[PDB]
Coordinates of C-alpha atoms and ligand atoms in Angstrom, one line a residue:
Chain A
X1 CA -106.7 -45.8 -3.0
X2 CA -108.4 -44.8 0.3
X3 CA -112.3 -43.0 0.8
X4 CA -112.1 -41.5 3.7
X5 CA -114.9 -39.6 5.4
X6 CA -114.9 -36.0 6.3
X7 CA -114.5 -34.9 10.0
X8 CA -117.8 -34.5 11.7
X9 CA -120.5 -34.5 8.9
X10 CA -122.0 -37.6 6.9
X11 CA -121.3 -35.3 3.7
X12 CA -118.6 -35.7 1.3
X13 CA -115.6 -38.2 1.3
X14 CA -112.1 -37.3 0.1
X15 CA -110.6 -40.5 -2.1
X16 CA -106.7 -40.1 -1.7
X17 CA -104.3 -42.2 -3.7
X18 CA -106.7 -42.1 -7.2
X19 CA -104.6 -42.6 -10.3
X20 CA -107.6 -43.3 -13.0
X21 CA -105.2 -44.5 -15.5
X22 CA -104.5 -47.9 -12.7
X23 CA -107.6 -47.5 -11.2
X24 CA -109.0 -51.2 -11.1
X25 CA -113.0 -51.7 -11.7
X26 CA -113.6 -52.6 -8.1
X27 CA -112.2 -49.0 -7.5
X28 CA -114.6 -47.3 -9.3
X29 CA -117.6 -49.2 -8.1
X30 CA -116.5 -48.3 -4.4
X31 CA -116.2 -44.8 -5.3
X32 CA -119.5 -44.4 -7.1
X33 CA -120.8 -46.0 -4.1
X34 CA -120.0 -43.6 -2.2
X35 CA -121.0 -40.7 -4.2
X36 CA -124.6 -41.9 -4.0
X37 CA -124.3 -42.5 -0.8
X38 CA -121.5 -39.6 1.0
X39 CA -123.3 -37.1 -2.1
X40 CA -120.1 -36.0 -3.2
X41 CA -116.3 -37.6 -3.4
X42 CA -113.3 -35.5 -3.7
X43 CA -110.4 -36.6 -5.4
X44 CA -107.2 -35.5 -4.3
X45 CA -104.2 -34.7 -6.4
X46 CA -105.3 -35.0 -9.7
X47 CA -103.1 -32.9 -11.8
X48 CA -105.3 -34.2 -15.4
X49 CA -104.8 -32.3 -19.4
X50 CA -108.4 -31.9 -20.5
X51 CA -107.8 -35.4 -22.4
X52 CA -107.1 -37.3 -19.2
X53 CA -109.8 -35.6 -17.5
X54 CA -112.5 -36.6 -19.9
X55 CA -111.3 -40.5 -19.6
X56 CA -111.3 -40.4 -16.1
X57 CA -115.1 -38.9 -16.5
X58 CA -115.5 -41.5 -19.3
X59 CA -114.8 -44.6 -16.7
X60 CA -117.7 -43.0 -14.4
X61 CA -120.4 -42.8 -17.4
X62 CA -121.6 -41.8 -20.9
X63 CA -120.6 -38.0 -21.2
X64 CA -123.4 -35.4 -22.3
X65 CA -122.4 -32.3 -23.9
X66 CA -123.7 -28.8 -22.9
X67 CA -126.0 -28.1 -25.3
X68 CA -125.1 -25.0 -26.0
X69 CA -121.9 -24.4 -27.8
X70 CA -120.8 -21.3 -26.1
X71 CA -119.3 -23.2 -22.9
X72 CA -117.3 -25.6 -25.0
X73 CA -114.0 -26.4 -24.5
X74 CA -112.6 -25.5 -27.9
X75 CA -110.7 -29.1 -27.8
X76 CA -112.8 -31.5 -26.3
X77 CA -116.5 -30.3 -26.4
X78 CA -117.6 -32.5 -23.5
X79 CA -116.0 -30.3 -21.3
X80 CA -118.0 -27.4 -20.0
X81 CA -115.8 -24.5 -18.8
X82 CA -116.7 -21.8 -16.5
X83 CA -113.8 -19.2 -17.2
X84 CA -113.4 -15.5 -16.4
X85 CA -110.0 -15.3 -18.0
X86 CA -109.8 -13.7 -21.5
X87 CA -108.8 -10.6 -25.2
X88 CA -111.7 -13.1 -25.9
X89 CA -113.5 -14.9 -23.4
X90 CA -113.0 -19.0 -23.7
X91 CA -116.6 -20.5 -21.9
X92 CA -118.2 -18.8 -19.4
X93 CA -117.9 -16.3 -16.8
X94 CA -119.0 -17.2 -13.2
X95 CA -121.8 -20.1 -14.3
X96 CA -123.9 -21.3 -11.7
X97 CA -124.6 -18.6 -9.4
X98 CA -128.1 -20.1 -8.2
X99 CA -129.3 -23.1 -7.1
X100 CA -129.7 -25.6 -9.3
X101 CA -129.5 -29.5 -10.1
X102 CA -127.6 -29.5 -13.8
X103 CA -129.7 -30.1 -16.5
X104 CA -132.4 -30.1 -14.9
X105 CA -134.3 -27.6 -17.6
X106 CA -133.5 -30.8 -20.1
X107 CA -135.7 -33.8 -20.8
X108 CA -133.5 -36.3 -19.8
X109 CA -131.1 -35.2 -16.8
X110 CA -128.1 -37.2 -16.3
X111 CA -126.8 -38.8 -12.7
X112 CA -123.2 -37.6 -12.2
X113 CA -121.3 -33.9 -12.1
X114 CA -117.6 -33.6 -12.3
X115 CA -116.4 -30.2 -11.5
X116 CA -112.3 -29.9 -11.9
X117 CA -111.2 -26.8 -11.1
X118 CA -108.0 -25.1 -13.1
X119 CA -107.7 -21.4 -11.3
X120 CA -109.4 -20.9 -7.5
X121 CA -109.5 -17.5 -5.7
X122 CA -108.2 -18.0 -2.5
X123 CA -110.8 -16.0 -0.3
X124 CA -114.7 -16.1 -1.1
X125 CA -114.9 -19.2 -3.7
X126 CA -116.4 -22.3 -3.4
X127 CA -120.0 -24.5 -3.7
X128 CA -123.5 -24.8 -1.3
X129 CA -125.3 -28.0 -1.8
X130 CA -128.7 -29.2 0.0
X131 CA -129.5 -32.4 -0.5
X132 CA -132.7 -32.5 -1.2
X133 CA -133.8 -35.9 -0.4
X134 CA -132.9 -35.0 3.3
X135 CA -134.7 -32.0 2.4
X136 CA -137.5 -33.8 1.5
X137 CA -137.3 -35.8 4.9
X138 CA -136.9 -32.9 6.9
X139 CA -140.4 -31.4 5.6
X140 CA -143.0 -31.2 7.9
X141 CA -146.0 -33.8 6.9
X142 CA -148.3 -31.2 5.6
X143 CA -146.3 -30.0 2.9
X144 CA -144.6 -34.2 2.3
X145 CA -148.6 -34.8 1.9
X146 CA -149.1 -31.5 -0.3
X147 CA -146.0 -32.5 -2.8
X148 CA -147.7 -35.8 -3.4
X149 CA -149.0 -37.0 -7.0
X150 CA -147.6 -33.6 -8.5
X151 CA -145.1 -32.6 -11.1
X152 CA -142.5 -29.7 -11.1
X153 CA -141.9 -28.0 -14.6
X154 CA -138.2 -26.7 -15.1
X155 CA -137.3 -24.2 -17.6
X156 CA -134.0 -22.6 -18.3
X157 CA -135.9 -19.2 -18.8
X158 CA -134.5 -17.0 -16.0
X159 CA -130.5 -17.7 -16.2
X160 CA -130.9 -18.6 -20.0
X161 CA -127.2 -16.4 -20.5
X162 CA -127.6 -13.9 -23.2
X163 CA -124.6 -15.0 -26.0
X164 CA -121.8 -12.7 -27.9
X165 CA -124.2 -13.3 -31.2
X166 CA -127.6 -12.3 -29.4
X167 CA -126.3 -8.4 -28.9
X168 CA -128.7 -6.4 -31.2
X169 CA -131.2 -8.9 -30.7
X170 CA -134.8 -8.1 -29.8
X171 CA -135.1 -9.9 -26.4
X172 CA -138.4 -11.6 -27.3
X173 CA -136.9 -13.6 -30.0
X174 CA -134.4 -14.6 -27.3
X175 CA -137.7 -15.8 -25.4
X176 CA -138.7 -17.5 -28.7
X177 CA -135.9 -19.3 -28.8
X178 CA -135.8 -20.5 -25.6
X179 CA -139.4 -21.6 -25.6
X180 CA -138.5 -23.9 -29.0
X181 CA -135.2 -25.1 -28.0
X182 CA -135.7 -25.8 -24.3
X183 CA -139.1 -25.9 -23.6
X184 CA -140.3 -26.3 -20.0
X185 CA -139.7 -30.0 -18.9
X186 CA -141.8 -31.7 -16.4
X187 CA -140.8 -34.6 -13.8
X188 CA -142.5 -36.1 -11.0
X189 CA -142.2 -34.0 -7.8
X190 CA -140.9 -36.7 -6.0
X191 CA -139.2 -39.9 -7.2
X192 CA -137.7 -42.8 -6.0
X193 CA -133.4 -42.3 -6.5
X194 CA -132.7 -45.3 -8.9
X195 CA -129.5 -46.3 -6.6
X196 CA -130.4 -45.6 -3.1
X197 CA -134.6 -45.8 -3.1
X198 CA -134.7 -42.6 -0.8
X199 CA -136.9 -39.7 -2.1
X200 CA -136.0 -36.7 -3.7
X201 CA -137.8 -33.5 -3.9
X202 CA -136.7 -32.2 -7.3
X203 CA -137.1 -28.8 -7.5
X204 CA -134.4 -25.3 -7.7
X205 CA -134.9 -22.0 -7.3
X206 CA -133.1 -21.3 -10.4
X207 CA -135.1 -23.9 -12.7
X208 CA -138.5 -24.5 -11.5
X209 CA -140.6 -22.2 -12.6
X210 CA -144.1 -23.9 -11.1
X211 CA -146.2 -26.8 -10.7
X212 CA -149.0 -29.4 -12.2
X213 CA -150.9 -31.9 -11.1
X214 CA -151.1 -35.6 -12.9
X215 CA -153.6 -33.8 -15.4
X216 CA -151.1 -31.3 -16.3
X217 CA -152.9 -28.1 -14.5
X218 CA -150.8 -25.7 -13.2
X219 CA -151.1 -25.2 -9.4
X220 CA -152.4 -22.4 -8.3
X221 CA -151.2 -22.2 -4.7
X222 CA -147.6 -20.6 -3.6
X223 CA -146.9 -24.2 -2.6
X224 CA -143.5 -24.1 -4.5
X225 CA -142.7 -20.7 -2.9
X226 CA -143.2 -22.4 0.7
X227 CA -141.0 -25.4 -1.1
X228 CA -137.8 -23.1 -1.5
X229 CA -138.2 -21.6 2.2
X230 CA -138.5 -25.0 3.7
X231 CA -135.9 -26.5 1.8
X232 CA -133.2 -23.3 2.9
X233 CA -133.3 -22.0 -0.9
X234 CA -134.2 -18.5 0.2
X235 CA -132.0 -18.1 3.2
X236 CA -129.3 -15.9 1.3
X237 CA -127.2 -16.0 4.4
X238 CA -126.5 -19.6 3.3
X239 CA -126.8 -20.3 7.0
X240 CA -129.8 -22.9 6.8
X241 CA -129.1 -26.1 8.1
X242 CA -130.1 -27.8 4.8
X243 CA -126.8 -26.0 3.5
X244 CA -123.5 -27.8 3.2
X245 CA -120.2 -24.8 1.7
X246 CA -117.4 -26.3 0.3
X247 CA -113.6 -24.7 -0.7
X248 CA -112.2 -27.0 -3.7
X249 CA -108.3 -26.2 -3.5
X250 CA -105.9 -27.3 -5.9
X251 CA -106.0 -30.8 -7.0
X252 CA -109.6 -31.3 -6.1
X253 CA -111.2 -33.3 -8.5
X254 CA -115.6 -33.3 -7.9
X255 CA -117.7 -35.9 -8.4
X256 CA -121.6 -35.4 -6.7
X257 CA -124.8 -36.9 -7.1
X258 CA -127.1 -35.0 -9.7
X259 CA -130.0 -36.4 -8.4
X260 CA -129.9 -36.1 -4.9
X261 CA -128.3 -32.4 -4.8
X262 CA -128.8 -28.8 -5.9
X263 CA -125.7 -26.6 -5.6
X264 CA -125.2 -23.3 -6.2
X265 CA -121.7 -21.4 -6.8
X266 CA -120.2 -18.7 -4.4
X267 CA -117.9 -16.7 -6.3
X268 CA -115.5 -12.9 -5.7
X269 CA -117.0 -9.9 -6.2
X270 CA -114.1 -9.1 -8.4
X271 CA -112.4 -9.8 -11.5
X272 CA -110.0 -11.9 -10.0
X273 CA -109.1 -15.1 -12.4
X274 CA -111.2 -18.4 -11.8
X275 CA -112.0 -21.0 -14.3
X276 CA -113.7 -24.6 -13.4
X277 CA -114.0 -27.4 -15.9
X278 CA -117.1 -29.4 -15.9
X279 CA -117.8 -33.0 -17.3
X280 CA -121.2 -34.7 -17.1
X281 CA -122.2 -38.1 -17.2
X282 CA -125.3 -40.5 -17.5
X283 CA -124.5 -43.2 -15.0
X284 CA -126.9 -47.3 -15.5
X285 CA -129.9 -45.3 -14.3
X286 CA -132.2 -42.4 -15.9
X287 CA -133.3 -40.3 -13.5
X288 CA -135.5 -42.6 -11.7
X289 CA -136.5 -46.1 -13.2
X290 CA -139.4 -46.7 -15.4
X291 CA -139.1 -42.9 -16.6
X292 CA -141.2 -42.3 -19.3
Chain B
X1 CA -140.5 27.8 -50.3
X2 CA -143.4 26.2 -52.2
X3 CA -145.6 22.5 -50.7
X4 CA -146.7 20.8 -52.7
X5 CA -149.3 17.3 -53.0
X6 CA -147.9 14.3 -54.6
X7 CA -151.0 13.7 -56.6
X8 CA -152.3 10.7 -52.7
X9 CA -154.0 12.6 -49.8
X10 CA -150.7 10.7 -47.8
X11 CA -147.6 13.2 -48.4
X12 CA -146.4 16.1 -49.1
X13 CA -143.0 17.7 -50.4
X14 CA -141.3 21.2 -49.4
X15 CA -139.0 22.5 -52.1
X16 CA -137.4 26.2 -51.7
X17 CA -136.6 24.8 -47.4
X18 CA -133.4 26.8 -45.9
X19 CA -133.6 26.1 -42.3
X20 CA -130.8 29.3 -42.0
X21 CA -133.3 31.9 -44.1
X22 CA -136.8 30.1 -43.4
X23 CA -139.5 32.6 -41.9
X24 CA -141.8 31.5 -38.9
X25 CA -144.7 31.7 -41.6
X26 CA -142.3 28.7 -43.4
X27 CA -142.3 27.2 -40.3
X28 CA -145.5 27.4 -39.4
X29 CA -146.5 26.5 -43.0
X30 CA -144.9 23.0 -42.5
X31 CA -145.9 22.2 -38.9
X32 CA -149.8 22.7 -40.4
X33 CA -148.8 20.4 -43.7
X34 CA -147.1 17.7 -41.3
X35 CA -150.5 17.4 -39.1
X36 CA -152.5 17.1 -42.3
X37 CA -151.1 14.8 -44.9
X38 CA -149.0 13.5 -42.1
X39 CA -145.2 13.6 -43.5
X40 CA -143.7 16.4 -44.9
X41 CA -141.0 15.4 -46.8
X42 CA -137.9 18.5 -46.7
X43 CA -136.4 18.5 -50.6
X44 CA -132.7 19.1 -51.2
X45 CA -131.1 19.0 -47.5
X46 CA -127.3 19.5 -47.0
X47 CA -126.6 19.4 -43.5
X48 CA -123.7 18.3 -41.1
X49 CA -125.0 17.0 -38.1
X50 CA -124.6 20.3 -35.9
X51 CA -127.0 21.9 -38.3
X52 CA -129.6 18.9 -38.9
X53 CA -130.3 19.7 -35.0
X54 CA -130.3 23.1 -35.5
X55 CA -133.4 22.6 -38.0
X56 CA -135.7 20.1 -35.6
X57 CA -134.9 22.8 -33.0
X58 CA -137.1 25.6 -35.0
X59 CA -139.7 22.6 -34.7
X60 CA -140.0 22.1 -31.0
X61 CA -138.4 21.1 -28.0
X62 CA -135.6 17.8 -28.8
X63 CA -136.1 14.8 -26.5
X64 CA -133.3 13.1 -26.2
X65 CA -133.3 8.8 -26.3
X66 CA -133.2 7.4 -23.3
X67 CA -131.1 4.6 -24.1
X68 CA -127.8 6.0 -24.8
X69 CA -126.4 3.1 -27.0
X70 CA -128.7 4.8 -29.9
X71 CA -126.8 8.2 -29.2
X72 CA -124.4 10.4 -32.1
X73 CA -121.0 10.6 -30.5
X74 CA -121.4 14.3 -30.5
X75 CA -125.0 15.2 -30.4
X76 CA -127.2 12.9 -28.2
X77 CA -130.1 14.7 -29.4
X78 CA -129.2 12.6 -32.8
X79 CA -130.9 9.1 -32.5
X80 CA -128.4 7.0 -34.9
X81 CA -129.6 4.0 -37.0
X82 CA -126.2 2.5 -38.5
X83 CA -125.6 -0.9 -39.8
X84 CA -121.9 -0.1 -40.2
X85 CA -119.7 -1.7 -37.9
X86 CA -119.7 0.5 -34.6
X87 CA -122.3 3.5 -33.6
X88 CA -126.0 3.6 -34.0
X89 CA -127.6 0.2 -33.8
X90 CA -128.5 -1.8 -36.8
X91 CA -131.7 -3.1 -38.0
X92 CA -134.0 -1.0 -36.1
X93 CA -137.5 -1.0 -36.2
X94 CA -138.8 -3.9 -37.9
X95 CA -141.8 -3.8 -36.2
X96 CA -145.0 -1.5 -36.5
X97 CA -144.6 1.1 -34.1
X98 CA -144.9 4.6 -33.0
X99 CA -142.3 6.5 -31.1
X100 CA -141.9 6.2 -27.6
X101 CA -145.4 4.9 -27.4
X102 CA -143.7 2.8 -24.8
X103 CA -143.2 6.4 -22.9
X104 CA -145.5 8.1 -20.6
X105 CA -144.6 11.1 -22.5
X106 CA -144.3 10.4 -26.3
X107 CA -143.9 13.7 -28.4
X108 CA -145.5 15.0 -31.4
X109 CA -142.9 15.0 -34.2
X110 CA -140.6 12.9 -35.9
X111 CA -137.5 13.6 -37.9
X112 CA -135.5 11.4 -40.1
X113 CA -132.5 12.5 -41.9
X114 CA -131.0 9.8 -44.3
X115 CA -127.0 9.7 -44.4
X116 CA -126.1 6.9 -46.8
X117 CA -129.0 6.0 -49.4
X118 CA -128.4 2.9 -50.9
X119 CA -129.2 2.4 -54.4
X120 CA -131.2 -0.5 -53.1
X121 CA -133.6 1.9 -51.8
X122 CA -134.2 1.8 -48.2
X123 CA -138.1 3.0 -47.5
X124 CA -139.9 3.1 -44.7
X125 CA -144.1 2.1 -44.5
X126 CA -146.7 4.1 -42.4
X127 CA -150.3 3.3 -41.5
X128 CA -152.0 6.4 -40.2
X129 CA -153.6 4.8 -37.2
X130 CA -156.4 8.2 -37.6
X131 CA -157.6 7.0 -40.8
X132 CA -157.0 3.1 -40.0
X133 CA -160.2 3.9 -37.0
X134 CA -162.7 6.1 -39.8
X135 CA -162.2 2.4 -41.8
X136 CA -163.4 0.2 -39.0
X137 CA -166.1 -1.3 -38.8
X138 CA -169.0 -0.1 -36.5
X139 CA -168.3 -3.1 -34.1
X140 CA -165.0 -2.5 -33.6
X141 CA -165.4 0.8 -32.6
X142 CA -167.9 -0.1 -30.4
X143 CA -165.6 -2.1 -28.7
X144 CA -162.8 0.4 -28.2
X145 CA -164.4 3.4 -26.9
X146 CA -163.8 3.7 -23.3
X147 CA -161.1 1.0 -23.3
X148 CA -157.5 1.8 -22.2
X149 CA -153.8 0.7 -24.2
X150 CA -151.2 -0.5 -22.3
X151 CA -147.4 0.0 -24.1
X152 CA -144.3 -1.3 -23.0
X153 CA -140.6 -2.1 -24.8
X154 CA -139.7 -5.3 -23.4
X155 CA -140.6 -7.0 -26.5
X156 CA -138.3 -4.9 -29.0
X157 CA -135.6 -3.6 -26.3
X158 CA -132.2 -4.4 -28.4
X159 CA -129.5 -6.8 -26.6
X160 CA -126.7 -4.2 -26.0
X161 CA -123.0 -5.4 -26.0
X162 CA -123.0 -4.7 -21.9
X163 CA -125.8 -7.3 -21.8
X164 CA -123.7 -10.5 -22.9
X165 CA -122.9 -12.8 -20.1
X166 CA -126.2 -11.6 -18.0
X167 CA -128.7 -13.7 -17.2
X168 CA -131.9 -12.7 -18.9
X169 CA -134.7 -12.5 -16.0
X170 CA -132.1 -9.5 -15.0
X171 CA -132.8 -7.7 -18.1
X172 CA -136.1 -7.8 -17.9
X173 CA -136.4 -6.8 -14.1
X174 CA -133.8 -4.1 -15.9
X175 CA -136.5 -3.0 -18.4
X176 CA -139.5 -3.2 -15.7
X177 CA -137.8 -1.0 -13.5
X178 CA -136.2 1.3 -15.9
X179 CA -139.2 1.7 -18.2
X180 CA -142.1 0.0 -17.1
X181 CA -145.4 -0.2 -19.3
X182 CA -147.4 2.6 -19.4
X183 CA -151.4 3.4 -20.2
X184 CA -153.3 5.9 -22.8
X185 CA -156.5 6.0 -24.2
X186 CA -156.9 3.4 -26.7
X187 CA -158.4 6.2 -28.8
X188 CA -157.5 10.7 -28.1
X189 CA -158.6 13.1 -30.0
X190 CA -155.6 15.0 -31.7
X191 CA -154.6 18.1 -30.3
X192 CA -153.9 20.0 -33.5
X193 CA -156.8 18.3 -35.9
X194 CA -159.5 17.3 -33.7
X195 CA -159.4 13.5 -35.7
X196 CA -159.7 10.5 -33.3
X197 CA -156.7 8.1 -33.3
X198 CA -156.6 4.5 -32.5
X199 CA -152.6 4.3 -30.7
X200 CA -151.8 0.8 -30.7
X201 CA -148.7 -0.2 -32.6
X202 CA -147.5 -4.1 -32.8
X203 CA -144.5 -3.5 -31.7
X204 CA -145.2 -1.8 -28.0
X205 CA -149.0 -2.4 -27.5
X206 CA -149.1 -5.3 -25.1
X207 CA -152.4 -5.2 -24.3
X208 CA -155.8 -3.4 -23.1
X209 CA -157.6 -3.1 -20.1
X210 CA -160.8 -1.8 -19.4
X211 CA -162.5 1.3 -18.0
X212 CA -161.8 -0.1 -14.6
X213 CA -158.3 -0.8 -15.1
X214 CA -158.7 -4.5 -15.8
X215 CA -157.3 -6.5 -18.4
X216 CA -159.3 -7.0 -21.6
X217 CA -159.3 -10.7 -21.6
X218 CA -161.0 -11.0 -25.4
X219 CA -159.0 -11.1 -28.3
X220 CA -159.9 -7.7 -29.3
X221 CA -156.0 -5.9 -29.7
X222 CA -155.2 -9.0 -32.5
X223 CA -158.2 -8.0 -33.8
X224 CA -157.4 -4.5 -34.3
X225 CA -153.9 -5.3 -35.3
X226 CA -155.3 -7.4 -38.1
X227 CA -157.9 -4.6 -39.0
X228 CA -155.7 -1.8 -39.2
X229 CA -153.0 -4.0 -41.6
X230 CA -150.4 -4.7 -38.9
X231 CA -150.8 -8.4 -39.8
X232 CA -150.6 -8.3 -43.2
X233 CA -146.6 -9.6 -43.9
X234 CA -147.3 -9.0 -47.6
X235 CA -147.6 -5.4 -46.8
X236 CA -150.5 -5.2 -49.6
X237 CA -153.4 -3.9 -46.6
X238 CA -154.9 -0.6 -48.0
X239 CA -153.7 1.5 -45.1
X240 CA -150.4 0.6 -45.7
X241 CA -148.0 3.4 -47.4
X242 CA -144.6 2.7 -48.6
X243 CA -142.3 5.4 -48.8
X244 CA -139.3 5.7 -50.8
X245 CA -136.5 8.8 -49.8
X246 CA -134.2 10.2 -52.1
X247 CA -130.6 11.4 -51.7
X248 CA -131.4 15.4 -50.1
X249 CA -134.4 13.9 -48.2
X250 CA -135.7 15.4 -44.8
X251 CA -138.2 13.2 -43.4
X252 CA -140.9 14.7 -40.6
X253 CA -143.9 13.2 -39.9
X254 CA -147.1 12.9 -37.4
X255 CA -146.0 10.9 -34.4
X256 CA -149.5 11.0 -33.0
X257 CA -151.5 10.0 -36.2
X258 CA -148.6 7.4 -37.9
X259 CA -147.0 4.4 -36.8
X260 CA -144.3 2.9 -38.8
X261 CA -141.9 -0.1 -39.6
X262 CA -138.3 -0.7 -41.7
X263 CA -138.5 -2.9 -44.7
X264 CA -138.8 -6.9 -44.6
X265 CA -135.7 -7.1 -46.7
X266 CA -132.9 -7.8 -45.0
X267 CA -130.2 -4.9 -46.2
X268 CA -127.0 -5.9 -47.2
X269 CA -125.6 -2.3 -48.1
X270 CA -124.7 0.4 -46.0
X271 CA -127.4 2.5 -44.7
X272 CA -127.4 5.6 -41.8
X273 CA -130.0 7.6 -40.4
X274 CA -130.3 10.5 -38.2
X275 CA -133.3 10.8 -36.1
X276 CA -134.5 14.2 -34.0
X277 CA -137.4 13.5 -31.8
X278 CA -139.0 16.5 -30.8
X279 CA -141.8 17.9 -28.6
X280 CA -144.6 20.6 -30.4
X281 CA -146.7 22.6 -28.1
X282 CA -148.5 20.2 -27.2
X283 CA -148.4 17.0 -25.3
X284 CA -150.5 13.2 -26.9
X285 CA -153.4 14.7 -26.1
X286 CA -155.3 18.2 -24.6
X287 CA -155.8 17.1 -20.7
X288 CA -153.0 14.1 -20.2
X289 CA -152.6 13.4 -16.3
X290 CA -149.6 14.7 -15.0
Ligands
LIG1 FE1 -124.1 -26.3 -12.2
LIG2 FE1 -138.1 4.0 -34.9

């Protein structure tokens, strides 16, 4: 097994020669190194059932299951599928399509994404990322000061996905639910990245919904607003420099740093056929240590 | 054609009603009983759909729902509630509320045409929102005069099976644009009996503002809901009527004065209903802004 780098950029590594079933121990400590460090490894030529896929996520972590059941893989539930091929639809169409840091609505966000695509379009398909503890470097030191001591609040609210069973529904028991089953979530604005001690502003367009302070008071300033332009989350020419595109092709095998990056999917405008399986794991770290 | 009381001040029935011989003095007879006692209820129908529209047109102007997933396959005046699997939507208004209240235009008259009567009957209650003001207390209508009602459907707009998949902030932005919230008087006179009627309804009534235009901060609309018996889930509140239809009923009742909601049961049985909505000479209230 070789990491190498990718050609002029300190982002990503492709790991060639990765058979996870001989794959010693020292091999996967070398490539989880340099997923918190390179922010995302690509495996090349993994040709995996959804059994063998799940081990190979298994040997990288604890798996966390979607928690809701409408994405589910109807033979392994771990596996989170993003599908557009039906004459019913198996997970979901086109997930993703906003950045984001996965589960970051949820109370306990976990380390590691693997995204294994099955079916990719060969024009217009692919991933952004920002890293946002760059990000967080590359803020000026007015707004570094300004982000200091708070807390972001995440909620699923706005791309909550209404369900097959939700038609007929009125939409504000839809809001009911959401507020009891995945209420807003609050983490520090900043923290320390349990593996690499760099900072990370934590904070999506997608998921964050405002701020607080220590006291839990919201804050009243469009600070979070002026957090998204900074960071390159409202440039949607996806030309900021924060803003890294990636094309999986066949064989590519995913595995990125949750804590470090937001991503957000870049899909047709067509019903062409793409699917992309998903398995995500808690690595030996919570989001950052002592995490209450 | 004879009307008669249903010895009640709420109701009235019409027995003798041939929408294909009435006179204009028949007509004319029932409009003034529906403003009165509020709903007139039409004895011993037998209509197909094309001539159940053809009887709310002798009664004004049809308005036709602007959601289209409601619609009769053949007659979009027809507003169909259908829990048989599938037109019409099921399970409709389970919430107190009047019609298009969340409409900068709402119209005047109401007509519901039951298709399949369970033997489980299928009612519907009313609370005539003109009557639910005279029984306030001084206070309270202190409070309200002068004071503005703002109405919106984004609380009770129905998923529809194009929705699924759709990210829900997009509906809503869907529903703001489409229908956005509207303002009336939180109390008009009524055009055709000179009562004053309090128009909030649970269901659409999001809130009030003040003469200004500025958001009535105090707790006053739960208030009023609770007054007026929108709160009462036991459905025991004086002001609340419920009515039971029978197999030939024609149902047409004051849209101004009443607001309304299905039964708490949930139905297991099927159960249709027509509905014509339906303009009458006059608009909520004498001297609306255009
Ligand atoms: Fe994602
Ligand atoms: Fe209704």
């Amino acid at each position: 097994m070789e990491i190498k780098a990718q050609s002029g950029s300190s982002f990503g590594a492709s790991v060639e020669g990765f058979d996870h079933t001989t794959a010693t121990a020292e091999d996967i400590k070398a490539i989880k190194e340099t997923i918190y460090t390179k922010k995302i490894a690509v495996l090349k030529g993994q040709d995996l059932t959804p059994a063998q896929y799940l081990e190979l996520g298994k040997m990288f972590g604890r798996p966390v299951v979607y928690y809701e059941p409408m994405y589910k893989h109807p033979e392994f539930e771990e596996i989170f599928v993003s599908s557009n091929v039906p004459g019913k639809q198996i997970g979901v169409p086109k997930t993703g399509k906003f950045w984001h840091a996965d589960y970051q609505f949820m109370p306990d966000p976990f380390g590691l994404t693997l995204i294994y695509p099955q079916v990719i379009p060969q024009k217009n398909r692919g991933t952004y990322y920002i890293d946002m503890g760059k990000a967080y470097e590359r803020l000026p030191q007015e707004l570094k000061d300004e982000v200091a001591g708070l807390y972001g609040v995440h909620s699923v609210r706005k791309y909550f996905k209404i369900r097959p069973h939700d038609v007929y529904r009125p939409i504000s028991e839809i809001l009911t639910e959401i507020e009891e089953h995945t209420p807003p979530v609050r983490q520090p604005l900043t923290f320390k990245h349990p593996l690499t001690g760099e900072t990370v502003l934590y904070i999506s367009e997608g998921f964050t919904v405002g701020l607080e302070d220590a006291d839990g008071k919201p804050v009243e300033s469009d600070l979070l607003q002026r957090l998204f332009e900074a960071t390159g989350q409202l440039d949607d020419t996806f030309t900021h420099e924060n803003i890294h595109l990636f094309h999986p092709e066949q064989g590519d095998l995913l595995i990125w740093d949750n804590r470090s990056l937001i991503h957000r999917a870049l899909h047709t405008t067509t019903p062409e056929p793409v699917v992309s399986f998903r398995v995500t794991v808690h690595d030996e770290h919570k989001l950052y240590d002592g995490m209450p």
